[PDB]
């Protein structure tokens, strides 16, 4: 707060996607189920109370009202109201929608849809504006043109949302490296030392952040302690290292560039080309440390080329220190926006309108349509 | 779903050419030489076999409600 | 969460919202009086002190005295 | 002018406040808790830079030299150690940001020299 | 004289000066509290900004 | 035009740029760059106009007034131009840069949204995304304006 | 000044063969260094528990994907060491691990970045032996097999849910206990 | 129980079947088929994996010189200024390289009257994980011996080295193994029966 | 290394391998699969265990120590989606059947409950109800708990299901 007030550090931006997480079907259902299960134990409590106050023995098989979970889950998934039916007018609506089976591209894009809980009819443009932080994560063209414009988004073709993992393996590795536990360190030592955050828990300080970052990246690139979803951000000017292992972080794969050269050499392409005979696959590409999942919060500190074959040679050096390279820049589009031929020769609203109409175009929507 | 009987634009019969085209493609013919072999000169007719997708082969995977 | 209380139940006659707090910020003293049984208590306050702190000092004096 | 800072009590470690010595007519720093007090060496109680002219260069840190997303020039050799590679960037602090002035940091470890031109 | 810092704690019906929250956590002296905030005491610009909060919680 | 913007950036970085009346230094710099890039776009469009043959069907539909404007011819043939959001060049969405593909503190034309290609030549991916950002404003304004004006 | 430290240690000599490869075994592969003998055999009391199919899946992998060797005597009584697994080098330079009827692709990847070295522990010191240049990673062939589907769980190897075999009356089990 | 034994025996029997064609890419054929066994020769030696945080090779020596030096490097525990222990990484001096090659060409393990010198290159902080630490997972290395087979061995200890923050030469004389070391080998041998 | 000339092929080879590994709805499946594998178990055991104490009736005319009941929910088991005919006969429920008969494609959830009861000063003897049934959880198609998991094209077509259907939705 002092830093911000002094102006030494810029304020945080609510629309920057590094500051956002997506609740997928998992955390959404866990949010209901937590409530229902707590209700189920409320009912076992009142039922057994009725039996045990009378000194009789309460049979739990009658105490469990099976229906609370069954009809609870079912209800909210059926209507889309994400909460207890008794208080339906207070909970979110439309979280669960009827799958659009009009055309295959509409089915695919509906399964890849993101929703911002911002109230409609809001005059503010900022939450609806295409923030730079959406590059490669969210399709820049596929959004409804109606009142929901910019609030309803769609994943880019290679956008992956982290499922999450426990931080304990990382914490153990940090504790065995030269990290001082926050409880052990002298406050005086925090001045000239980086502060390490794991899932937002400040867990220690480290004297040599550069070796730490190089080590943490090497681990992720070998898939051992650090699973590949984890994202380590090095805030140099801030002297902070933030490691995130939580769920819902939207990230995408990128090629690694160690010097002005891709780590992806012809041997990988050749093995990948044979993936029918030998089962060499994307997993081996990730495990060999050629590809990496960069997250938006981590992408603020990566220097990214667009195409290696032109942006790594030089005439007068522009960057000369790239760290990653785009696989193919067309991966920034979504499902409906990537069927457009030559979208880069079109005015962007036209691309948006085609993304909208590509979900209304008739065709064989599924092969078992006669069933 | 099934190869159209006639080219939508001009009317040339192309319904009898999908199997032949598949056989030509089973040989190493390039689709352009395949189309020339089948006698499709106008681009409207060539569009029929180049763009056709035989979905009836997928629909036949299902057991019939005899 | 919510708005802080400003009227209290007289810990002696238990009459609800019968006690009000006068805060003499000049002499640094708070005075609480039951508008029903007229019981009173006075405690030293500071600029941070709110009516809820006076009432608490009354309760702490009562809880300490009733032993 | 300088910039005055906090002073702490040796007994209770709480912050000291200025007091004029009503008798000796000098400036004393005194604890609001224990009766600890000491003679002040500065005679300045407070200062307030309205212009907010700040040596923005002092807040720059040598660790920024290894940022991969920062532009580099061999055209501006290090004034201290003569090393050719230097990273350059603007002072993004609200009052300094208006000036668009550049700041350079040497790209050589244990040199860490930061300068402005 | 101005720029007091207050924390809005959960379940606490009113804003509490952060220095009171630090004393409540057991860090009673002002030096010790500031050690958890102002990591580098060589910074008068930052310290001059916490004085109003140390004053409010005196 | 790109060389001129680079020279203005050098002058600004060297503090050789004098703040004009009312404006700040950073605002006068932005005004200077916008002026240079507007001149570039307008001049390229104008040169495009005079090169069109009398049988050109864009010209036939523009001089008739039926549909289109000379700015559309300029964007289709010569250059698309600057992409603005809320009247300013593309903002530093990331920390001090518009996209991970650019270097920090890059105020150049293509770094801040100036689309230098035409719709015939196609848009580079960075300026494709900047064009998407610029076009999104039109959609948002269309969606929000209706409810304010109907009332 | 060059500081002289004298130490007495036995030299460890190693036959590193033609190629040395780093191997991290995936969850679907394991190695048993003891010879497989049904006599004194491991008391594999998994089926004793009557495990559900996450566990029988684990048991299947435990039986089928373990690289084992055994000592067999010929009619002359000569002890011959036999392996149930073998690595095949192909004419195109690829490799595959054949374990009985199971077949696995073997991908050779050079170890970039990692400076992994082989050392031998001797007392309190370590003697260097080699630098790992390539690691081998194994993947099952025969993806058509249901075991390929199930192997995903082996990778996933805190309590976890268990899967019942769909058995029972349950609406009637509800209704009957309800009586 | 025997339902498992019967299946295990089947895998050995299936392994006895000759192989003649690739399981895919039919034009390919088997160049060599090798049984996989625990390395009966090497299993007695406790192999440990050392992972460096950065390239440990000395800057002025490249290629084969770097590999040969590192393959013969020795790592020893040392004690710091306060008495806390750390790890010193020693590389063979040029004479040691020459001596080792001489003795190997002479098929001797070591010359009994010779001493082998190694110079310290770097200090590293070390993190040791072994079978005795909870949650330790075993990494293996495979040795391919053409015409003989593929023999695998276990990496009983995993050591992770990070750059730390006395120019010492380690002079090594070889000796015979004592009973305790021989017992350690026999104990390792015992992991192959009973 | 990949020359500029070959880079256009290599780029789409890498992308195609990505889409062969991960479908288009992988984020959905993964999320749901992790909810069933972890979040449901964690939610159950993190619940506050039941502590019931009987209301003192004072019938002896004295202040009694009323009996208290303890229940702790333990392991969770989840069977495949199952349809029971009205007579209770068990059958695996095919998604397509559910779609046609308006069923809910869900799996029954069972939890081990260990009961314990402390009567006044007398001993407690925990008794347990293994695998009691808690309601049914709807399953997302093509997840690991679904019936269409790792099933080949022949199988899917045999189930009157579409091999191209991404799954990732509930019925
Ligand atoms: Zn035609
Ligand atoms: Zn004091
Ligand atoms: Zn320098």
From TrEMBL, chain A:
Bilayer-crossing regions: none
Domain RNA polymerase Rpb2: 97-161, 196-258, 282-329
GO biological process, one term: transcription by RNA polymerase II
Major location category of this protein: nucleus
Cellular location(s): Nucleus
A molecular-function term among this protein's GO annotations: zinc ion binding
Gene Ontology, cellular component aspect: chromosome, telomeric region; RNA polymerase II, core complex
Assigned keywords, A-Z: DNA-directed RNA polymerase, Hydrolase, Magnesium, Metal-binding, Methylation, Nucleotidyltransferase, Nucleus, Phosphoprotein, Transcription, Transferase, Zinc, Zinc-finger
Keyword Nucleotidyltransferase among record annotations: yes
Family as reported in the entry's similarity comment: Belongs to the RNA polymerase beta chain family.
Protein role: RNA-dependent RNA polymerase that catalyzes the extension of a non-coding RNA (ncRNA) at the 3'-end using the four ribonucleoside triphosphates as substrates. An internal ncRNA sequence near the 3'-end serves as a template in a single-round Pol II-mediated RNA polymerization reaction. May decrease the stability of ncRNAs that repress Pol II-mediated gene transcription.
Name assigned to this protein: DNA-directed RNA polymerase subunit beta
Organism of origin: Sus scrofa (Pig)
Organism ancestry: Eukaryota, Metazoa, Chordata, Craniata, Vertebrata
TrEMBL record, chain B:
Record-linked Gene3D superfamilies: Homeodomain-like
Pfam family, one: RNA_pol_N
Gene that this sequence comes from: POLR2L
Entry keyword Transcription: yes
SUPFAM superfamilies hit by this protein: RNA polymerase subunit RPB10
UniProt key word Metal-binding: yes
UniProt GO BP: DNA-templated transcription
Superkingdom of the source species: Eukaryota
InterPro entries xrefs: RNA_pol_su_RPB10, RNA_pol_suN_Zn-BS, RPABC5/Rpb10
Gene Ontology cellular component terms for the protein in this record: RNA polymerase II, core complex
Localization per record: Nucleus
Keywords tagged on the record: DNA-directed RNA polymerase, Metal-binding, Transcription, Zinc
Identification of the protein by name: DNA-directed RNA polymerases I, II, and III subunit RPABC5
Protein family: Belongs to the archaeal Rpo10/eukaryotic RPB10 RNA polymerase subunit family.
Stated role: DNA-dependent RNA polymerase catalyzes the transcription of DNA into RNA using the four ribonucleoside triphosphates as substrates. Common component of RNA polymerases I, II and III which synthesize ribosomal RNA precursors, mRNA precursors and many functional non-coding RNAs, and a small RNAs, such as 5S rRNA and tRNAs, respectively.
Ligand binding (Zn(2+)): 7, 10, 44-45
Molecular functions per Gene Ontology: DNA binding; DNA-directed RNA polymerase activity; zinc ion binding
UniProtKB/TrEMBL annotation, chain E:
Protein location: Nucleus
Family note: Belongs to the RNA polymerase beta chain family.
Function according to Swiss-Prot or TrEMBL: RNA-dependent RNA polymerase that catalyzes the extension of a non-coding RNA (ncRNA) at the 3'-end using the four ribonucleoside triphosphates as substrates. An internal ncRNA sequence near the 3'-end serves as a template in a single-round Pol II-mediated RNA polymerization reaction. May decrease the stability of ncRNAs that repress Pol II-mediated gene transcription. DNA-dependent RNA polymerase catalyzes the transcription of DNA into RNA using the four ribonucleoside triphosphates as substrates.
Protein name (record): DNA-directed RNA polymerase subunit beta
Organism: Sus scrofa (Pig)
Segment of the intact protein contained: 378 to 435 of 1300
From TrEMBL, chain F:
Location(s), subcellular: Chromosome; Cytoplasm; Nucleus
Function: DNA-dependent RNA polymerase catalyzes the transcription of DNA into RNA using the four ribonucleoside triphosphates as substrates. RNA-dependent RNA polymerase that catalyzes the extension of a non-coding RNA (ncRNA) at the 3'-end using the four ribonucleoside triphosphates as substrates. An internal ncRNA sequence near the 3'-end serves as a template in a single-round Pol II-mediated RNA polymerization reaction. May decrease the stability of ncRNAs that repress Pol II-mediated gene transcription.
Membership in a protein family: Belongs to the RNA polymerase beta' chain family.
Protein name: DNA-directed RNA polymerase subunit
Full protein stretch here: 709 to 859 of 1970
